[PDB]
């Protein structure tokens, strides 16, 4: 029977990450279910062992999945991880693509925290999006995890904290729907851009849809140019009309951060915590689902 690491029975495909497909797995020794990411050993741009080293630098951080085993076998580099619960995109679909304000605010607090923690370990994520956050299991069911470090990179030197240099005219790789404006302009990404994408994720949870989502084109890049100029031609005040102003204040703050600015995470988290208490919700971690 098909086994990787001579211990993890391979199951159906359960998604597709960056530079690699994800499979359900079973630990035959424990009976525990796992996630298995595969990368063809003979790729010209190998990544999986880099991503697993980053996962190893990130361990201990709250909401970071554990790495069970990493190796090579057959046609694949193999990375085995802790299996988590549904993704935030899955759960958004589960709730008929509408979240309560309270759930948006509970998620926003935890997602800023995940991102700040990655930043404190000298890395930016660069693919902030609903599929890349997953809820925990059982006793960790109220905890938001961040996954997929296949596009992560150092934004600063690990000993001097010297920030990476500013660059322009980059053909960048991301998720078009959630990318920040600066990425659409070819600018080197940095801490500001993770939090800007979170802000679009928040408005996505709020609306069901984004104004630049579901556009018609033929070619791929000309579908990307249409997303880029609809996103840019949509003022934050018009995207966030009818909603509490904290979502616009959030997005406005992120676009006015400079390339190498350290974000004031505590300010942003406080924006949403203040509205949460003004609304009279209680931080009892009860999400919509």
């Amino acid at each position: 029977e098909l086994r990787v690491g001579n211990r993890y029975r391979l199951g159906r495909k359960i998604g597709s990450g960056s530079f690699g497909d994800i499979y359900l797995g079973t630990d035959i020794a424990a009976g525990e279910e796992v996630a298995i990411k595969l990368e063809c050993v003979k790729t010209k741009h190998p990544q999986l062992h880099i991503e697993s080293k980053i996962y190893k630098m990130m361990q201990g951080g709250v909401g970071i999945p554990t790495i069970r085993w990493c190796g090579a076998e057959g046609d694949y580099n193999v990375m085995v991880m802790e299996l988590l619960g549904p993704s935030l995109e899955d759960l958004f679909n589960f709730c008929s693509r509408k979240f309560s304000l309270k759930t948006v605010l509970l998620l926003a607090d935890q997602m800023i925290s995940r991102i700040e923690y990655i930043h404190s370990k000298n890395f930016i994520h660069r693919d902030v999006k609903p599929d890349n956050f997953l809820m925990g299991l059982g006793k960790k069911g109220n905890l938001v995890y961040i996954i997929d470090f296949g596009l992560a990179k150092k934004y600063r030197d690990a000993r001097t904290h010297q920030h990476i240099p500013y660059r322009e005219n980059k053909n960048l790789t991301g998720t078009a729907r959630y990318a920040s404006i600066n990425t659409h302009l070819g600018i080197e990404q940095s801490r500001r851009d993770d939090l800007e994408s979170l802000g679009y994720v928040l408005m996505y949870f709020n609306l069901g849809s984004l104004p630049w989502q579901g556009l018609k084109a033929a070619t791929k890049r000309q579908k990307y140019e249409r997303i880029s100029e609809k996103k840019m031609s949509t003022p934050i005040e018009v995207l966030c009309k009818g909603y509490p102003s904290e979502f616009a204040t959030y997005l406005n703050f992120c676009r006015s951060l400079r390339f190498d600015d350290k974000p004031d995470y505590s300010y942003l988290r406080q924006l949403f915590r203040n509205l949460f208490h003004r609304q009279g919700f209680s931080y009892d971690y009860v999400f919509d689902w």
Partner: peptide, 7 residues
């Protein structure tokens, strides 16, 4: 193509 990883 808007939520696929791409360029």
């Amino acid at each position: 193509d808007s939520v696929m990883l791409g360029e």
